Design an enzyme around this catalytic site. Sequence first.
Site, short mmCIF file in Angstrom:
data_model
loop_
_atom_site.label_atom_id
_atom_site.label_comp_id
_atom_site.label_asym_id
_atom_site.label_seq_id
_atom_site.Cartn_x
_atom_site.Cartn_y
_atom_site.Cartn_z
N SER A 236 15.12 102.93 -78.81
CA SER A 236 15.75 104.20 -79.18
C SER A 236 15.20 105.42 -78.45
CB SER A 236 15.69 104.42 -80.69
OG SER A 236 16.70 103.70 -81.37
N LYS B 110 10.74 111.30 -79.61
CA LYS B 110 11.74 110.29 -79.95
C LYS B 110 11.08 108.92 -79.91
CE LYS B 110 15.46 108.57 -81.17
NZ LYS B 110 14.47 107.87 -82.02
N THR B 111 11.15 108.20 -81.03
CA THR B 111 10.60 106.86 -81.17
C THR B 111 11.63 105.79 -80.77
OG1 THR B 111 11.21 107.09 -83.50
CG2 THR B 111 8.91 107.41 -82.94
N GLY B 112 11.15 104.57 -80.58
CA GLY B 112 12.03 103.42 -80.46
C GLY B 112 11.29 102.16 -80.88
#
Lengths: 12, 259
Positions: free
Chosen positions: B40, B204-206
Amino acid sequence: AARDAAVSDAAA
Amino acid sequence: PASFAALERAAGGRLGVCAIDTATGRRTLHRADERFPFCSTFKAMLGAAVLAQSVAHPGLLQQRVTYGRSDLVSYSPVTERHVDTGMTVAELCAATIQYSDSTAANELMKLIGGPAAVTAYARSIGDDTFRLDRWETELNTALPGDLRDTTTPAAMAASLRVLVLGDALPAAQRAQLIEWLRGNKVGDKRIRAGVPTGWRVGDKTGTGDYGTTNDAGVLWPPSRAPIVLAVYYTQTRADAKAKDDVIATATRIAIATLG
């Protein structure tokens, strides 16, 4: 390099 | 662990880090030119691509997008609540950036031309590494050796630098991207857990299979120039569990090394 960019654009 | 080597040893797997001190251009790196499945984290690039379209098409962010229940894919906690109301383009950007909402990303990609449009946007901001090949939620398979849906820590750090701190976007759109990143709600245990008190964060993480655990963003000290940080982490077994604390510790190591 030009090959590096080409790899990023190539179909899998 | 106080070095990336020690952290990767303790955690197992493969850790990629690029952190840039924008006061000097100095970088601290680990596997920074190796590809990782971005999961993500690409939603930062997607949000920027949509913001760029809003420059050419003023008012785009306020346009209401409607979609049917059958559009929903796995992990859509915000969009599944808004079938009736629709969501504005800006709301979809916020939902996919701040919660990783899957359908929100797909709806935005449908508006701008699909995964290929996100890759083309990356090329337009100087990123010749990023490649988005698949729609949500396929792009999270994170298979070893697979080029699909990958970037490097160094490329993502460079892209976030130009998007958040540079002029890839005009000032108003840049401020909007920053606020979306600042309001991330699903990264408390990652980069945000590794910064000193008073530092501001947008990120922003993923997350994906192979225990893939990622986070990329920008850190604003109160009295120092910002630091850009991209962390990618993936593991040997397909069934590995994500390791939030690896990201938090990598963040602390990056900051200590640059300080």
